[PDB]
Structures are given as C-alpha cells and as structure tokens.
C-alpha cells in the first residue's frame, strides 16, 4: 500500500531484510514520511514549472518590474525546491543503504 515507485522498491527489498518486526513497523512509518517528502518535492517542482511558465510570459513581455517581481519569486522558489530535493536524495540514500546492509549483514 504505497504510491511512489521508490518507496515501493524500498519496501519490496526491505521485506527480505533481516528486520525485526518492530524495526519493520518503524521502517514502514519511515517510508510513509519519506513518501510525504517526495510528494512535497514533486509538488514544488511542478510549482517551479508553473512559475517558469509565468516567467517565460513575463520575459517575452519584457516589463522590467514584472521581470524583477517574477525573479524575486522564482529564484527563491527554486532555492527552496532544491533544498527539498537534496533532502529527498539523502533520505533515499540512507534508506537504500540500510536496506542493502540488512539484506546481507
């Protein structure tokens, strides 16, 4: 019962790991939190795309004030989106490494 391919893969691999049932339940909750994180990431990437569409329209228009406002919004939004992206990448690395370690031991 998961919606993102990465969390499905991680759960599928962690099924065969040497996890205690307690650690398995805690890992399940952790994958739910990681799923929330990736949904936040893709939502804000799509928001970045829509802001890029507005920015493209503004730059085609060429208004300096519109360009400045859309820049203030867009560069900060891209910064935040990257902030979420690196966190998602790190969490994926942690979970995958832990599962792989728990498959061999």
């Amino acid at each position: 019962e998961f919606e993102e391919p990465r969390v499905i893969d991680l759960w599928d691999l962690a099924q065969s790991a040497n996890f205690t049932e307690k650690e398995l339940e805690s890992f399940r909750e952790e994958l739910k939190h990681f799923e929330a994180k990736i949904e936040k990431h893709n939502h804000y990437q799509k928001q970045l795309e829509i802001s890029h569409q507005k920015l493209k329209h503004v730059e085609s228009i060429g208004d300096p004030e519109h360009i400045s406002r859309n820049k203030e919004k867009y560069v900060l939004l891209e910064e935040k989106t990257k902030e979420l992206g690196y966190k998602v990448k790190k969490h994926l690395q942690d979970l995958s490494s832990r599962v792989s370690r728990a498959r061999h031991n």
Partner: protein, 1167 residues
C-alpha cells in the same frame, strides 16, 4: 477546502505542522506544537526530529547545521574565543595574560621575543588604532582587550561587540546561564557554588573518596590524596581489573580476570562474596545500574555485554554483534543510555558507541581518529561523555549525542597510555599503564597532570565513590517487576511507548507474543570452536546468544550434541581430553567421562535409548556409553581416521566417516555390528555428516572435492548440491528445516544454504577462529520412542545396553568385561575373555577423576587432572613435591618452581619470597638495545614510544616533549616518537596519519599485489577459491577447467565426467562411479618376497603378518592369519584389444552412457 495562507493560496493541510515555512508569512508553522523526538532521534534547534545516525555524518540536516556543530576536534582556526591569541604556523591559542609573561607558552614560542618577526614585548601601533577599551602589548602588533560578553569585531579592530561568554569551554563548572551579558554559573541541587565559578558537594553527603586498583589490590583514598587504605587484597594470585560501586547499598564491586571471578564488598571491606564465577573468563570492565539494582558486565573471552542482578542472579546478554574488542562501559539510568568503547570491531573499525540500556538502537557515537578507546565515564549534570585513548594518547569529550567534541589532554608527554577514567566535580581521574600511576587532571583543559597515587604495578579501574555520582530517579521496573515474567531491564525514557523499560528473560527462554510472558526456547544453532561452545538463534536479526557460552582456560572444543529433555549440551574439550555436560543456563557442569580418551573428534547422542557415542581419532575407534549407569564399550575397533558420527534412533542405524586415502562412509546398526561401506566412490576427506530428519536422507560434505552430497540411508539415490561460492574446506554441517548450515575452516565462518539445491550462501557468523562442529539444538526433534523406551517395560528389558536395530527392533548389549548370558538380555561377568583392568599403567598416577597423568606431574604445583588430585594433600614427609616444584618449608604446600622469588607471596608461610638473593650481576644488555631500570633489555627503538615495554616505566621515564627522536625513529606530529618499522606497515599509528600516508606498497617476494593497490597478500592465497583482496582480484584470471574437460593432471571419470587426481588412477581402488579408473591398462604391482601383499594392495614385512597391529591399514595382515598362539612369550570414440566382449571407452570430454556402448558430449556449450 484547504488552509489559506496570507499569500492567497489554499495550501494543502499536510504542509501545516511540518517545520517548514511553506508560504511567505510563515503562518503554517506559527502555532502547531510538535511531538518530541525519542531517544533514537536527535532534536534540532527548531525542535525537528532527525535520525540519530544523521548526526556528525558530514551533512547539514537541521538547516541550522546543529547536527554538525563541531564534530571535528582541535578546531582552533586562530579564533579560540576573545582574550586569546594564536601562535602563527601552528594554530595553538594562548590567553592574553600569558603571552609576554617572560617565558614561552605555546610550543612555537611565538609569545616571546624572536628576531625572525622582529617582535619584542611591547605596545605597538595600537596607540594610534585605539579602541573603546584597553589596548595591549602583543609583540606582533598592538591588539586591544575586550570586556566580558563581547568579541573584538574583526571588521573594526576598535569596537567590542556582543557574543556569549556562557558557551566558552570551561567558563563555569556545570550548567551556565547568561543574564543580559553577565554569565551566571548556577549549580544543580546538592552543589554549593564557590569562587563564583566552581561548585562543591554539600556536606549533606559523607565527604567523598576515590576507589581504584593499584594493580593486584583494591585501594581507597580521599580526594586530596593523603590517607590511602587497602579495601581488599586479591586472593589466589588474582588482579583487580575493573571497579564500580553502589552508594545506597554501601557496596563496591570489582572484577578479577586472573582468578576469573567477580566480587563485591562493603566499604568497611568485611562482607565479601563472589558475584559470578562461570563464563566470566575475562571480565574486562564493570558498571553499576543503581536505579534498577543491576550490574552491567563486559566480557572479552567471548565478546559480549552481560547484565546481571547484584549477587549475580538472572543472567542475560544484551549486545553481541560486531563486538570485536569491547573495553570500556558507562551508563546513565536517569536518561536510559548505555555507552561502551571498542578498540576494533569484527568489521575492523575501532569506535565509541551508544545504545539504550536494553541494548537497542546502537549508534556510532565517535568514529573518527578514535584509535584504542580504553575507558569511559559520564558527566551526569552536564550530559557529556568522557573517554580516553591509549594509542593516540588523548582525553576527549562529546555530548550524549556527539556534538561538542573538545579535547582536554593530548600528547604522549601527558597521557601516554590511559586505561580507566572517573569524574568528580572539577577534576577527572585516570589510570595510566606507562606512568604506572593514578592521574588527576582538570575536566576542561590541562597541560600537566598531577600524580594522585604512584604504584609499582600497572593500575586499572579508577572510580569516585560519592552520592552525587549516583543521582536519584524513579524506577519504572520498581512496580510488579515491570510486569515481566523474569527480568525487567531499563531502556530510554521514551522507549516502549513511554514506559521506559523492556522485558527480557533468562537463558533457556524466549518471549511470547504477549511480550511480557516468556516460554522455553525451542531451537537454536549450537556450534563449537576452539574458544568456546556457543548457541545462536537461527534468525539472523536477533543475534544475541541464547545459552551461556561454555568456556575453559586451556580449552579446545570440538565435539557437541544435546539432550533437550534436561536442556543440557555435551561437549569434548580436546585440550583436556574430557567429555562434559552442562545445562543451558550455565549451571550443572559435570564430567561424563575422562578415561581412555585420546582425541574425541565428534559426539552424537541417542536420545531415545540415552546412549552417547563418540569417535576417537587417537584410538581409531568409536565408543558407546550409557549415561544412566556410565558403562561403556568400544563397538568398532580398527578404523583409520574416523571423524564424524550420527545415530538414527528410530531407523536404528549409525553412520561414520573415515577419510583415510581409500575414503569411505560406513553404516552400521546402532549396536555397532553389521558394519559396511555405503559410499566409497568419489570421496576425499568426508569431514562432516548429518541427517535430514524430515526426508530421512544422509548428508555429507567433502573437503577435497569441496562438494555437498546427500543420499538415502542405504547410500542409494546419491545427489550433489550446486556450487557454493567460497566454500573450500567445509568441516561440519547440520540440516535444519530446509537449510544446510556448514562450518568452513579456511573461511573461519558459518554459512547457510538451501538443502534442495546449491542455495544462496548466507554467512551466519564470520571471523570465528578455529571453528568446529555445528549442531542444531531442537527440542521437537528429540521426541519419539522405540522398543528401547516403551513406558510399560524399561530399557527394552536389557540389563545394561539396549540398541535400536533397523526394522523396528532392539538388541541388548553389555559393558566391557561382561557377556550376554543364555537369556540374551542379562549380562554376566566374563573376566576370562575380557579381564578387568586398572585406571592406567604402573608408570602414572590415577586421578580421583578417572583421568590419568604422569607420575612426574604429581605434586608439581599445577593442577593437571582438572579435578585437582595431583596437588591434593602434597608435601607430607612421605609424599614429596615434584623436583620441578618448591615446598613451603613448614610443610603442606607445593608451589611451582616458577613461583619462587617472583615478587609475590604464594606460600601460606611466605617461604617462596623469603631469603631471595640478588641476581643482577653483569646483566650485559647488548649495545644494540636499551637497558631498563629493572635490568631487562629491549630494542633501543622502543624508547619513548608511549608503551611500557620494560614493564616498569623505565623506557618511557624522562620522556619529555623534546622535539627530537632517536635518529632511527619516525616522529608523529605533536604525538610521540615511533619505530620506523611501523612506518607504512599496513595500518595507522600516528594520530595525524603521517606514518601510513602517501607511501607505496610494493610487494615482497612470494606476494601478490591486488589490482587496486589495496594491499599485498601471500601467493598461496592466490587461486584458491576464496576472495582475499577487497577487489576479488586474487581469484580473478585464475586457471579454470576447460569446458567439460579435466585439468591435465586430473583423470576424468567416464561415468559422470568428474575429475580425480592422476595418482588415484591405477591404484587398486575404484574411485569412479563405474570404476573407469581401474581399467585393464593398469598393471599390477608385484610384492618382493620379503613382504606380504595386503588386500588393499600394499607391501608389509613378512614378520608383521598377524603380529597385532593394523600394518596393512585394513587388518588384512591380521585377518589372513587369525590362527594365533594360545601361550605366553615366557565404441563410439575409442576401441581396445580385450580378450572377450569389447569394453570400449570413450574419449575425454564425453560421458560413457549406461549401455557401455555409446557416449555423449559433456560440455555445456552446443556442438
């Protein structure tokens, strides 16, 4: 629908309560209070929870970088707080008052006059660049002072600007808090603030005292050390290793690895009792859990951390996995954390790590530059952990989460070899093996530790006895024993859903799904090795042992089996030549037999008839013994090298392996009669045997051909499992459920594969020394009956022995010297055919145990029977001590000669040390060496290496920080001098790493270089089937067998296509399935008339025929003349030229089909 931010967006409700400001006005995170972070999670500055393993991993995770707030030590950066200045070129920082005091301060000496910079003590250009405050007289240039609460702003050089003094390391002892820029050193309850900076214990507590081991003895002294007193002397040549205390119990505990015991006493030293005395072979350290009245013990013979009640009851093991060399231990029951150090794990890394007090949620607290961490203590009020390093020679500190790493001492001139450590108020106390003293130092930073006590022996285990050292707190387990069935162990306060404790149960039991109740264990993996006999769960997740590890001091364990009705395990100590039995819980060790045992290689137990069988490699025989009456008999007498043995109580068979050159696996009735080979083709070294009880199939394993095979109990339906990746010398195996567990000698590991096919190799245990037999303990397996155990008539109506026989029958047997009378069920004594015998010959002394030892060993001072009888009541006028010993002259005690004049009084009368002469003379330490003050000689290069090689501290005496070494020596930066032999030797020795940095590992002779340049290995380890290089480059490119072929030195069997060594061809024994290796082309060997020709095809002297020795290795020279004296000495591919019907063989690379007329290609590849 959704929450609306001030920006005007219906923001998803999931973005509220998530620590992230998801819209411009931050209203989504303005109100929502968040849940706390448990013990296994780290609190960020904003309250966010992250995994504990994310702290100090090298990545900023709290977006404040609070989880990476100074994980690296010695981060001076010339910054080092205001009022301080740094010597350029080193980064060392010195406060302002010391710079230009008239003497150099930093190791550079930049704080005084020098002509390189042209600097003199004086006020420079600061007279023009005045600040708002005092300028100063720094030689390099006038800098200016700052009042409290303010740094000098780097942009200004003139204005001091706010910061916090309350964060400076060492500003106040204990907690601090800042009042508008004024720091206040509040002290926790029970402490009185003094001098405005220091807090002292209130006189509501009975002063304080320091308890430490001076070496042999346990001493106690005041904080201002003047009144040392001996609290307990070590009896029987013991040594006090690690100490701890319980304040409210008035109790002090200590361990003793020379006597292999754990003791306890009161501070008056009167009431003394030994806590533990089984399976405590090397009790490295100790810790007291005062809240829950339990004792945490570190053991290093079998690396584990055990927790036990006071007075030594309710044993249970907490941590076993990857434990390597555990040395230090400490705990804080008020919070629920357990800290212990490790100077090298099974994975190699030395580390200091943290866990819950129940052993869960382990975490690498400190991992970089760790070295040899030897001791740990806790600052409970400040929530910091202190630990020492005996290899990089420092004392460092981190918080409970590992954030604020600070170093309090560094260098071989200060802390050459710390072992223990203890903390109290403003000071920290630590033993040192090189200074031979208990040291005293400031808890924050210090440059010259004062000697607190000086000892002539290596000291261990400092601790400070006080009430504030063990604060009061509530006990969750204090009510109803926590509700658990047997044992209640604390955990972190947030563990177990806020209950703060976890239920466990003693050895021989496991928890029910109710998780408070617990029931007996049903099955576990019993395995044996040289070090110990251990039992581990079959699941790989919960790795902790489930039985008390059996251990002996000179021991070497090989054989194992079990009796699940009594929950006991049988084992043979090949070093003692004794067979024991012992319960699961560790109690009840008893001797099964000790007579006529040369080398017992394997054990098996018939649980229905209660018979114990074992194979003797030295007697070349297998013996059966009944536990009910200790009677025994040899049932097979003239084997060559019997190794393994299994008995099938219901089927009534036994199976044993003989790996002498014509290797075979034999089957017999459980009586030992009807002996017959059942597997004698394609065998080399059949080390292990097993039975698949579900399918009734015999399993064996070869160490020559490295294959696992299984077959029916008749030897028919033989099958072979697939290749197992790295298996190259498998010794023992066992079958449980659908898996096969095998021990491998070359790997030194236990691997598990499927029993259906080759399986997926899973390494259960690794790096396990001289591993031996493995057996699956199983209470369910040992349920059954036969005509030997019917409830209505006992023992099958036999007198002494009853043996199951195939086809559901029984056969009676008799002990030695007794025969079955007419009845076939009752045994009558027959001394005529089997005369009664004595324990052993006239040349030796029979113990009171059944074992026999040489007469020279009697009264030599050391126990040789292991049931002390050769030293019992020696020294009487007529019973002399052996001339290798020394008699305590007033009579009644014979000590070994080695104990005479060894600076330790062993005799009851002290004669062993009385009248000892002086023996120095011209001790003549050669010119190539350094001479110690105790007249020992060591290599000159070992001087000033921060190691007490002289065993008196002389080679490290007067080892000031000189800045030079011996010319031959390599110098670690700011650490020590080291021998060049250790430079580029393979692993790290200096803290900065210079000794192993940048160098090239060009291999020696007979060594192979890995493809990645990781290391060099022996050429013997190349092309062996085991991966030795980390890149598997040692087994890459090795010669292989051509497809379907055999190597040029290997004859190919035409029946199956396997390969045998060429010397096995034309040897008289059919090694191939159909005997292709003994074709007519092989010429017979004719024996010179001076020799008899054996049935096995070998030559033996004419004189040795039926002489009473298995000279032909099959008794053919005996059985060819059992007439003995009755007196006293007083065409598909090839064609041949056979005489009759053709016997055409096929060419190599083909399989001769069962018709004997055609053959088929053997290669996988297609034509």
């Amino acid at each position: 629908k959704e929450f609306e931010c001030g920006s005007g967006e219906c923001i998803l409700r999931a973005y509220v309560c998530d620590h992230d400001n998801d819209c411009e006005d931050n209203s989504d995170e303005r109100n929502c209070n968040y849940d706390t972070c448990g013990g296994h999670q780290f609190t960020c500055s904003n309250g966010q929870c992250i995994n504990q393993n994310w702290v100090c991993d090298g990545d900023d995770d709290c977006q404040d970088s609070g989880d990476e707030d100074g994980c690296e030590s010695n981060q001076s950066h010339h910054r080092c707080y205001p009022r301080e200045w740094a010597c350029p070129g080193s980064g060392r920082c010195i406060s302002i008052d010391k710079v230009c005091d008239g003497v150099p301060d930093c190791p550079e000496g930049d704080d005084e006059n020098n002509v390189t910079s042209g600097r003199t003590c004086g006020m420079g250009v600061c007279s023009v660049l005045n600040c708002e405050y005092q300028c100063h007289q720094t030689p390099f240039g006038g800098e200016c002072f700052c009042p409290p609460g303010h740094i000098i702003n780097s942009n200004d050089s003139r204005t001091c600007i706010d910061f916090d003094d309350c964060q400076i390391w060492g500003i106040c002892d204990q907690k601090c808090e800042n009042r508008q820029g004024r720091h206040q050193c509040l002290c926790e309850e029970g402490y009185i603030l003094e001098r405005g900076q220091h807090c002292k214990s209130s006189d509501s507590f009975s002063a304080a005292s320091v308890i430490f081991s001076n070496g042999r003895d346990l001493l106690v002294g005041d904080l201002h050390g003047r009144n040392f007193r001996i609290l307990a002397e070590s009896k029987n040549r013991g040594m006090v290793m690690g100490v701890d205390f319980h304040y409210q119990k008035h109790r002090v505990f200590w361990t003793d690895p020379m006597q292999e015991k754990v003791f306890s006493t009161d501070i008056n030293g009167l009431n003394t009792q030994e806590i533990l005395n089984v399976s405590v072979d090397t009790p490295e350290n100790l810790a007291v859990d005062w809240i829950n009245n339990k004792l945490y013990l570190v053991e290093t013979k079998v690396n584990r951390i055990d927790v036990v009640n006071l007075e030594g009851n309710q044993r249970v093991t907490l941590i076993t996995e990857n434990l390597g060399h555990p040395r230090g231990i400490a705990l804080d029951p008020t919070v629920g954390y357990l800290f212990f150090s490790d100077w090298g794990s099974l994975s190699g890394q030395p580390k200091v790590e943290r866990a819950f007090m129940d052993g869960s949620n382990r975490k690498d607290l400190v991992t970089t530059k760790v070295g040899w961490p030897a001791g740990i203590t806790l600052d409970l009020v400040s929530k910091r952990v202190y630990w020492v390093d005996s290899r990089y020679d420092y004392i460092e500190t981190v918080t409970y989460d590992g954030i604020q790493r600070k170093t309090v001492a560094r260098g071989g001139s200060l802390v050459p070899h710390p072992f223990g450590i203890s903390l109290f108020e403003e000071h920290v106390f630590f033993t040192d093996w090189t200074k031979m003293a208990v040291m005293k130092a400031s808890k924050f930073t210090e440059t010259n530790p004062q000697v607190y006590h000086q000892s002539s022996l290596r000291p261990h285990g400092v601790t400070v006895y006080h009430a504030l050292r063990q604060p009061n707190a509530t006990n969750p387990c204090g009510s109803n024993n926590g509700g658990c069935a047997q044992v209640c162990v604390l955990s972190h306060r947030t563990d177990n859903g806020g209950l703060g404790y976890r239920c466990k149960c003693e050895f021989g039991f496991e928890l029910d799904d109710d998780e408070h109740r617990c029931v007996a264990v049903k099955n576990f993996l019993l395995f044996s090795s040289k070090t110990a006999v251990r039992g581990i769960p079959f699941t790989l997740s919960t790795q902790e042992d489930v039985m008390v590890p059996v251990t002996g001091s000179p021991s070497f364990f090989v054989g194992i089996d079990f009796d699940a009705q009594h929950s006991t395990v049988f084992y043979s100590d090949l070093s003692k030549d004794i067979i024991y039995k012992q319960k699961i819980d560790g109690t009840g060790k008893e001797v099964i037999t000790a007579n006529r045992l040369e080398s017992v290689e394997c054990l098996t137990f018939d649980w229905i008839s209660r018979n114990l069988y074992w194979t003797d490699g030295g007697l070349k025989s297998v013996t059966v013994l009944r536990l009910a009456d200790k009677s025994r008999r040899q049932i097979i007498s003239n084997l060559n090298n019997p190794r393994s043995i299994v008995v099938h109580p219901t089927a009534g068979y036994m199976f044993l392996s003989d790996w002498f050159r014509p290797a075979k696996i034999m089957r017999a009735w459980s009586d030992g009669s009807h002996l017959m080979p059942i597997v004698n083709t394609s065998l080399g070294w059949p080390n292990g045997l097993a039975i698949d009880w579900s399918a009734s199939r015999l399993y064996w394993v070869d160490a020559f051909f490295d294959k696992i095979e299984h077959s029916t109990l008749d030897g028919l339906d033989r099958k072979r499992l697939g290749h197992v990746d790295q298996m190259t010398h498998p010794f023992g195996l066992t079958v449980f459920k659908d898996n096969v567990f095998i021990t491998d000698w070359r790997l030194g590991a236990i691997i598990r594969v499927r029993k259906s096919d080759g399986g997926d190799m899973t390494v259960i245990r690794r790096g396990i020394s001289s591993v031996m037999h493995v057996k699956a303990y199983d209470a369910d397996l040992q349920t059954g009956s036969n005509y030997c155990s019917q409830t209505t008539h006992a023992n099958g109506d036999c007198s002494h022995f009853c043996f199951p026989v195939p086809n559901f029958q029984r056969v009676c047997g008799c002990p030695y010297g007794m025969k079955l009378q007419r009845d076939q069920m009752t045994c009558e004594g027959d001394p005529a055919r089997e005369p009664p015998t004595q324990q052993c010959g006239s040349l030796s002394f029979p113990c009171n145990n059944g074992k026999c030892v040489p007469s020279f060993f009697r009264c030599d001072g050391v126990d040789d029977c292991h049931d002390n009888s050769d030293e019992h009541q020696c020294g009487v006028f007529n019973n002399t001590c052996s001339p290798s010993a020394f008699a305590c002259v007033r009579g009644g005690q014979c000590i070994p000669g080695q104990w005479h004049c060894d600076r330790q009084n062993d005799c009851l009368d002290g004669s062993d040390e009385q009248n000892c002469p002086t023996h120095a003379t011209s001790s003549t330490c050669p010119s190539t060496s350094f001479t110690c003050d105790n007249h020992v000689c060591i290599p000159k290069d070992w001087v000033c290496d921060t190691d007490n090689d002289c065993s008196d501290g002389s080679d490290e005496k007067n080892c000031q920080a000189s800045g030079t070494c011996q010319p031959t020596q390599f110098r670690c930066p700011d650490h020590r001098c080291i021998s060049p032999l250790y430079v580029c030797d393979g692993d790290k020795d200096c803290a900065d790493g210079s000794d192993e940095a940048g160098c090239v590992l060009n291999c020696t002779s007979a060594q192979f270089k890995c493809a990645d340049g990781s290391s060099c290995i022996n050429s013997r380890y190349r092309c062996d089937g085991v991966y030795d290089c980390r890149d598997n480059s040692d087994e890459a490119g090795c010669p292989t067998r051509p497809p379907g072929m055999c190597h040029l030195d290997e004859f190919q069997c035409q029946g199956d296509g396997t390969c045998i060594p060429n010397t096995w061809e034309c040897d008289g024994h059919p090694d191939c399935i159909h005997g292709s290796d003994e074709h007519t082309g092989c010429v017979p060997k004719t024996c010179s008339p001076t020799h008899f020709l054996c049935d096995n095809g070998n030559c033996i002297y004419k004189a040795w025929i039926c002489d009473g020795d298995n000279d032909c290795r099959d008794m053919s020279d005996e059985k060819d003349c059992p007439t003995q004296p009755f007196h006293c000495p007083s065409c598909s591919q090839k064609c041949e030229n056979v005489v009759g019907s053709y016997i055409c063989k096929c060419a190599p690379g083909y399989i001769r089909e069962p018709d004997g007329k055609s053959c088929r290609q053997n290669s996988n590849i297609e034509p």
